From a paper:
Recently, we demonstrated that [name] and GxtA are responsible for complementary site- and stereoselective C–H hydroxylation reactions on the PST scaffold. In accordance with other characterized Rieske oxygenases, [name] and GxtA are composed of two domains that make up the catalytic α-subunit: an N-terminal Rieske domain, and a C-terminal catalytic iron-containing domain. In a single monomer, the Rieske cluster and the mononuclear iron site are located nearly 45 Å apart, a distance that is too far to permit intra-subunit electron transfer.
We discovered that [name] operates on a number of tricyclic substrates, preferring β-saxitoxinol (β-STOH, 1), to install the C12 α-hydroxyl group, generating the potent natural product, saxitoxin (STX, 2). The crystal structure of [name] was determined to 1.86 Å resolution using a modified model of dicamba monooxygenase for molecular replacement ([name] and dicamba monooxygenase share 31-percent sequence identity with one another). According to the DALI server, [name] and GxtA have the highest structural homology to dicamba monooxygenase (3GOB35) and KshA (4QDC15). Notably, comparison of the [name] and GxtA active site pockets reveals two differences, namely the inversion of a hydrophobic residue and a polar residue at positions 255 and 276. However, in one subunit of both the ligand-free [name] and GxtA structures, the loop is ordered and can be visualized. In [name], this loop folds in and reaches toward the active site pocket, whereas in GxtA, this loop adopts an extended conformation on the surface of the protein. An equivalent tunnel in [name] does not exist due to the orientation of the loop, which closes off the active site cavity. Indeed, although we find that these enzymes share 88-percent sequence identity with one another, the 195–215 loop is only 52-percent identical in sequence and only 29% identical over the portion (201–214) that plugs the active site tunnel in [name].
Residue numbers in the entry:
A (entry chain A): 2 to 206, 209 to 296, 304 to 334
B (entry chain C): 1 to 200, 213 to 297, 304 to 334
C (entry chain B): 1 to 297, 304 to 334
Write the structure that this text describes.
Amino acid sequence: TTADLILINNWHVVANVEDCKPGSITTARLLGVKLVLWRSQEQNSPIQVWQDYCPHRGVPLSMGEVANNTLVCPYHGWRYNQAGKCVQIPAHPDMVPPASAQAKTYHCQERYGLVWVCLGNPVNDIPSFPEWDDPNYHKTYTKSYLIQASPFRVMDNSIDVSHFPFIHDGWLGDRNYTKVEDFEVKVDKDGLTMGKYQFQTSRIVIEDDSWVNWFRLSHPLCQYCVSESPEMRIVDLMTIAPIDEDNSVLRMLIMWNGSEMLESKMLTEYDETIEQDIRILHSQQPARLPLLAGLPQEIHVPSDRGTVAYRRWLKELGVTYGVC
Amino acid sequence: MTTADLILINNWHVVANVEDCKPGSITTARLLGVKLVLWRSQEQNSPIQVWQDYCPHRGVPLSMGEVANNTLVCPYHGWRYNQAGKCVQIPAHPDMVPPASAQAKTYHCQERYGLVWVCLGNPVNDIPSFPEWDDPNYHKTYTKSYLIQASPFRVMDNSIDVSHFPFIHDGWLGDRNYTKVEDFEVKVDKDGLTMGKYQFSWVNWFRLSHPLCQYCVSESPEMRIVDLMTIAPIDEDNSVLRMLIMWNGSEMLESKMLTEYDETIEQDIRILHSQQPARLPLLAPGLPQEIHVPSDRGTVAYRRWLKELGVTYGVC
Amino acid sequence: MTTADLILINNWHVVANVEDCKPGSITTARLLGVKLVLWRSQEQNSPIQVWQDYCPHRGVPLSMGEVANNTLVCPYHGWRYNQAGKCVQIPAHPDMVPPASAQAKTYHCQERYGLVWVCLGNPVNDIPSFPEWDDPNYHKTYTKSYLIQASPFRVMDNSIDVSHFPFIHDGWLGDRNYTKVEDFEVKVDKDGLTMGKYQFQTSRIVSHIEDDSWVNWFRLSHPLCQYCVSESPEMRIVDLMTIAPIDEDNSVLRMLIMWNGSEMLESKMLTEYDETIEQDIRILHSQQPARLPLLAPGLPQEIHVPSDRGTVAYRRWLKELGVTYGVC
Ligand code: FES
Ligand code: FES
Ligand code: FES
Ligand SMILES: [Fe+3]
Ligand SMILES: [Fe+3]
Ligand SMILES: [Fe+3]
């Protein structure tokens, strides 16, 4: 579509590396752009991420096939090498393909088992995830969640902490303990950091009903969360793929230093609470996130200081896509 | 799809039947482009609140919450709104007095004839009158609601139209062998529009003081039937039709009367859904202009009335 | 919606097959954003009327009515319209003189090749010619009608294209081992767009295994109809493809197929066309932008190679004709 600079020139997860097998074709959408992801059959072949579009007659390349180290358009069989250049036009086998015959290619990097894509010029680093190679931690990935809400409303809901005892009653919050103690938030050059805050709840992951959480966003659509009890530490990297201004894909990478056998329960806790959030996200109007300044204007109370700082951060960053 | 037409925004409109709103219940409706939430506390005889279905904190519909004591509680962070619409409790800050702006947008609501009437503006006009409501010799019945994909003014146009009876209502209100329409009278003054007696047996007349409500009278030597038809204007292109039917014959006719009304309402809806343009064409304006014959005098009068009232919503 | 393009409004378009308009029948169609009603009286050999599907009294579709004698009767108040579209009876006022405005909007209709052609405007062009129609050497069959969510001009672009045969029609109209496209000529002139004889290699289900060299040729005098001749040393197949432009983004494709060979080939002829038409539709539905891009020195612009000379010439011809509907 018509996204902004902090968005176009940043890295976004569009797939799990396990989604992209050798010789395979898959698709995604990012910032209004249709993407094709493909790999040759070679062992550990790299992933190409291109705009899903043959410039000859406008057919999606994802409808084609991988042949050797090339992607072949189904309509007239033009073949594109790994750099996106047309190397063969079958109707004219002795013709040099015109230089214009080329797919639009994007930057792709595999990191944390996720496929990261930059549609522009990649001036930012991929967000840090310190536990990735820590041998004390195990990992698991949630399924993806397609959410009919603005990506910035999706992240707003993930920075929100006061909703835990209501839509997450029995999982992350306690309807008996609704008060939200004070906490600190700072927005600097490291992005947005929400400081330590304690909340009363036990988790399927029992007398352990005191958890201290904090989180950081260096990237407005990624969040690194740390949730700690005396017994265990759980971290997660949530990535929100902005399909367009009104639709999102949520993925979460979870790591924990307890027993590896907790994996099933971890995925259940996250699945339950994600779907609880999605019920609210789908209902919110207007769909795009209102920035600080028909329907009434938003109201803020002190426990909204982090979601207020997020709206302020988005404005300073110059975000206009998916917001209002 | 909202309106500034005063005759619409400053008027009363039926949005529900009172039996639909039990104590402790939450229901939804739409009126003139606005999403409404209707709720009652669980105490007996509790009043009906009708609000814009929206929490001003983070934009969640209040209808997704729950009724607790005398309050409607938003599901997202549990802000509690009392029957007057004021937020009385913000659970994250139990000792804080909520901001003055933590307020639901509330609308006027009145129960009359067993229906829930709502005014979204200033209630300048009054609810249409219905004399037989106070008459112990008349039984009453309510049709189900009918959702119609047509402009509410085209819906009312079809109810003022009387020459179609022998065609789409053949066998029920008309007879294909008697198609000629005899002369009848219609006047528009500032009591509204009033169809003079006519007959296709049954002698009928009707009047509208409200452009989307109709009071019909149908009389025979045996008995007389009155109905109050109300057309809820959801937006410019969608309507909810209800009828309140009263009659002074045997009460056991109810099942048949409901069937006769159901048959002919559905015959009308088949026409209403097909008509183009969707908005009602007013007089003197790639589709040709309307044609009028003498038996259209009532629907012509209706188009003239709507122009004098200044209607622009759902009309062209 | 509608178009002011004269080449489209003042031209003839197929909207139905004559077999779907029985005496006494009412059917519907849509053409260039206009809703049509097609009807016939019960009489033997009655003509087909094609009118705007609209009663000017209160705006009801006349197609919801019924045919009575030689009139179409609106269901709402029973106004009766004769074959010329004039209202002859207003039942509420049986003695009145119906106003001149009580008249359906009527269009030009003409049955040819067993198809119903309609002109919404002033017919300055003729229905395209299909010489084999009157040849008793030739058998005929009609495909079913295919609703396609693509611009009618993209649908025709795909039918002018020949280099795609060995790919999406591999095993039917081409061979993945013979993908080179021989040279051929194209002309845009008084006749419209003509692709000269083009030889390609394939065996086909409608002929013998060794009959594996075919020669195609086609002419469009009308930008949404195509007369195509496909010939081998063993058989000659001709077809008249017609694309009904429902609106800018939706089309109805019909094909009338004739061949000079055994009448028993009919089932195989319909199988081949159905299989290849559906392969073409899979591509058509995927193409973006939806409207056909014209020539012009967001999405990257089209590239053209020499075997595109016919589809390039088509884009040039459409601009020369003044087409703006369904093109970009
Ligand atoms: S459209 Fe891709 S090769 Fe022609
Ligand atoms: S959205 Fe209603 S309490 Fe926060
Ligand atoms: S709308 Fe056709 S006769 Fe009245
Ligand atoms: Fe949550
Ligand atoms: Fe009726
Ligand atoms: Fe084809």
